Ligand binder design. Structure first.
Ligand SMILES: Nc1ncnc2c1ncn2[C@@H]1O[C@H](COP(=O)(O)OP(=O)(O)O)[C@@H](O)[C@H]1O
Ligand SMILES: Nc1ncnc2c1ncn2[C@@H]1O[C@H](COP(=O)(O)OP(=O)(O)O)[C@@H](O)[C@H]1O
Lengths: 753, 131
């Protein structure tokens, strides 16, 4: 039977299109743009237009939610496709809306909604279906009651439509498309993949699972900063896979008076067990099961014990899956993390720039944007925000846009008009104002993400590039040879050299090339964990680093220990070596299998304690020479590529003359040249207004001399006070520290075979 | 590292628990690597952790003195710099015998190489004795 296939999530937004792989396209002898009949459970037939896609496999058919709700199927089910080239044109229809999507509209639904949807679309329709059309501010779904010929027809330019009639009620089989799905979550692809992997089988196929006879998961923890959307993930999984999502609040259970709180929780478990494969969601777990020290009273201990007993009472035969949500995994009582209880942990981190882009894209599907929208710029500008903050941003930007023009539009008394809520186009002046008034919530948190520095950003340093590529990329690409050759991969690299030579840029670039998460730790943070507590502050950092493998952990200014300890203070030495001791302790304990790479940076290598420089620990040392007249041309090109360049270019005396410059002074030279250019531009502008204030209409046109330009004069006014960032004496001491190893390397003569 | 970890905060609990664990699992060969670490640490500019150093050394001395000779629990310590260590340890009833470990030379080195390069590949070309 070459008809049965399995449904999967699609990518195209158009409702009446599906994606097929080329071999199934060829075998079924179907062409592009035709109509095919689809059937599934409950004897539901749908019409759709075939579209090509190589990404999907042969058995995998890609199809979006509205067609799925038409077919009354779910993900992973079985559907069959049959050819249907005999569909004909159409006639009188009686399209009608549903009541709970039209309340307070009172407008020309024909012109506003159906006309744009059916214009140059040629979308086939079938009797008895539900289709959703996007419009002004809300989501509107319409239903067909009859057509001619029945049931199949294709909407044609020459047909008669009627959108006149009282709204109908719900079909009473739910199928509400306004609920959540997999398309309403963005920026959490890997975590959603893990959840689908570990939850889909016990819920979709219980009989086969109990036939195999293997232990299913009994608990999942989701921990992260508040507002990242854990409840959304639970609701989406429960709705899409098919379950009886039952929510238990923390504070609501806590404040139920007397010793009656336990009765409600027990009733909740007993009621969930007796219905169907369910997903009990315990919100704010730390509110009812805190640390032992915080439980001053006695009712809290009784509640926690009741929870533990009920959780243990999940003997073999049980399709109930318990999911819990919490903040950082230190408030939870340790006894809950045994085996049988909550054991799996999934980390829902703060979204990065790309994730912010998908969040913004999702939240503005309804809104009528203008042509001035630059959402990628806003995403690049909004670092430090979570999902809820971006939703609020979009909402109040829409409110600002409607407020700006409200007297002129019809305020009516009770309803709106469809037409008036269509010229509403939010613009960038609204979004800039929206950003101006908004307080981010995350801010002071460690952020892990893929750095955006590309190899072309850094100039020169080919030897160091080769060494890094050998050291980090090789062990994870061809593992068998390492095991078969005795060689056991290296752990970390320590950098040293004059300051400002670009160690951090190189670390970020290698992390980007290796395609792994990057986490950066600064000296001030190390000083902070110096003065006070140094136990956990070196614990959760390593826990997060190991959890998000593959990773490239970067330690910056590791020499601040000796930089601050050395001197007349001497009293901070205890808390000082506390930090280095912790680093050694949890860096000598990491498993060799884990692909967690540690990189150190320093500029005064002689004063670093030699305990770190031992085999097994950070051992390889790479010397970063101070760039001199070989490569500064590339550095100048790299940091002047973004600016509107210049005429006559440097390529010459500008680079040639300087000998012994780091990158910092070159960057500040570029900044000062651009500052002089801006000063000249603004002075010319101010002169223009100070001249035209006493003049009549002078055919004022775009002539304002606004074209950016940074000629040789600006550079001349720049290198008149540049300073040598690195002193000459530093080179001597750094090269002597290198000479220690090189003279230890003195014996290198080729001996007899 | 563990010695210094139980040198910057508490000093008593860890020594008691480690000696109890060693005693209960007899016979065993307890090992104290880098016994000179504390002396190296407090021999510099740092001069505040000396009280905890007294604490650690006193614990080690006390729960060596309290060990019954019938129980079979040895103690072995290795120090890089012997002179600066506490001379109270090198007393009868404590670490007494001193064994000097020289730098391997010539005939020992070829055996060192033979032991190391067992690995999985071979070196049938170069002569180990020459190197
Ligand atoms: N793709 C998304 N990722 C994260 N958050 C989202 C996304 N889409 C919407 N949100 C917002 O996240 C909010 C989740 O609220 P809430 O249940 O308080 O999250 P949590 O319980 O995880 O703190 C919703 O109000 C929604 O507006
Ligand atoms: N291609 C380049 N090579 C060297 N330095 C650069 C390059 N491009 C930019 N820089 C400058 O070098 C700085 C990197 O500083 P960093 O290497 O972290 O200092 P340190 O070496 O003291 O840790 C950046 O601020 C940047 O201005």
């Amino acid at each position: 039977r070459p008809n049965r296939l399995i449904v999967d999530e699609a990518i195209n937004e158009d409702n009446s299109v599906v994606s097929l792989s080329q071999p199934k396209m060829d075998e079924l002898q179907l062409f592009r743009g035709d109509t095919v009949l689809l059937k599934g459970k409950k004897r539901r037939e749908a019409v759709c237009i075939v579209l090509s896609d190589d990404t999907c496999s042969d058995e995998k058919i890609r199809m979006n939610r509205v067609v799925r709700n038409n077919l009354r199927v779910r993900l992973g089910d079985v559907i069959s496709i049959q050819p249907c080239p005999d569909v004909k044109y159409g006639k009188r229809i009686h399209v009608l809306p549903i009541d709970d999507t039209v309340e307070g509209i009172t407008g020309n639904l024909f012109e506003v909604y159906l006309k744009p949807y059916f214009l140059e679309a040629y979308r086939p329709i079938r009797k008895g279906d539900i289709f959703l059309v996007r419009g002004g501010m809300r989501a509107v779904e319409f239903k067909v009651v009859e057509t001619d010929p029945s049931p199949y027809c294709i909407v044609a330019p020459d047909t008669v439509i009627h959108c006149e009639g009282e709204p109908i009620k719900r079909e009473d089989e739910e199928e509400s498309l306004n609920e959540v799905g997999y398309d309403d979550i963005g920026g959490c692809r890997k975590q959603l993949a893990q959840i689908k992997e570990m939850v889909e089988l016990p819920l979709r196929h219980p009989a086969l699972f109990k036939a195999i006879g293997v232990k299913p998961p009994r608990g999942i923890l989701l921990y992260g900063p508040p507002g990242t959307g854990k409840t959304l993930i639970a609701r989406a999984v429960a709705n899409e896979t098919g379950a009886f999502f039952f929510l238990i609040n923390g504070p609501e259970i806590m404040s139920k008076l007397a010793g009656e709180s336990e009765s409600n929780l027990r009733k909740a478990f007993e009621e969930a067990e007796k219905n169907a494969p369910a997903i009990i969601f315990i919100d704010e777990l730390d509110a009812i099961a805190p640390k032992r020290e915080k439980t001053h009273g006695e009712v809290e201990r009784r509640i926690v014990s009741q929870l533990l007993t009920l959780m243990d009472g999940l003997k073999q035969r049980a399709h109930v899956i318990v999911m819990a949500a919490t903040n950082r995994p230190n408030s939870i009582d340790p006894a809950l993390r045994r085996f049988g209880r909550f054991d799996r942990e999934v980390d829902i981190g703060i979204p990065d720039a790309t994730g912010r882009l998908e969040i913004l894209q999702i939240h503005t599907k309804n809104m009528k944007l203008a042509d001035d929208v630059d959402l990628e710029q806003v995403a690049n500008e909004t670092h430090g925000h979570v999902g809820a903050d971006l939703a609020a941003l979009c909402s109040e930007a829409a409110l600002q846009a409607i407020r700006k023009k409200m007297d002129l539009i019809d305020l009516e008394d009770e309803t709106i008009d469809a037409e008036v809520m269509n010229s509403l186009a939010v613009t960038m002046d609204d979004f800039r104002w929206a950003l101006s008034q908004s307080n981010p919530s995350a801010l002071r948190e460690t952020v892990v993400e893929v750095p955006q520095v590309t190899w072309e950003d850094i100039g020169g340093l080919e030897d160091v590039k080769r060494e890094l590529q050998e050291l980090v990329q090789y062990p994870v690409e061809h593992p068998d040879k390492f095991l078969k050759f005795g060689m056991t991969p290296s752990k970390g690299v320590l950098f040293y050299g004059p300051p400002g030579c670009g160690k951090t840029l190189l670390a970020k670039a290698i992390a980007n090339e290796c395609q792994a998460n990057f986490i950066s730790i600064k000296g001030p943070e190390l000083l902070t964990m110096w003065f006070g507590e140094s136990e956990a502050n070196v614990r959760e950092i390593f826990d997060k680093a190991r959890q998000a493998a593959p990773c490239v952990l970067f330690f910056d200014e590791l020499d601040s220990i000796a930089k601050a300890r050395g001197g007349n203070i001497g009293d901070g030495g205890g808390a000082a070596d506390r930090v280095i001791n912790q680093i050694l302790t949890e860096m000598d304990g990491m498993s060799t299998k884990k692909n967690v790479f540690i990189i150190g940076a320093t500029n005064r290598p002689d004063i670093i304690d030699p305990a770190i420089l031992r085999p097994g620990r950070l051992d390889q040392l790479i010397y970063i020479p101070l760039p001199d007249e070989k490569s500064r041309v590339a550095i100048l090109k790299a940091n002047l590529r973004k600016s509107p360049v210049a005429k006559d270019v440097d390529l010459e005396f500008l680079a040639k003359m300087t000998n012994g410059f780091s990158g910092a002074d070159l960057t500040e030279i570029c900044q000062r040249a651009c500052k002089l250019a801006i000063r000249e531009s603004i002075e010319s502008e101010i002169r223009r207004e100070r001249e035209r204030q006493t003049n009549p209409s002078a055919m004022e046109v775009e002539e304002d001399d606004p074209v950016p330009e940074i000629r040789r004069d600006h550079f001349e006014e720049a290198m008149r006070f540049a300073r040598r960032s690195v002193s000459d004496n530093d080179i001597r001491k750094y090269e002597m520290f290198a000479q220690t190893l090189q003279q230890s390397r003195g014996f290198g003569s080729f001996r007899f075979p």
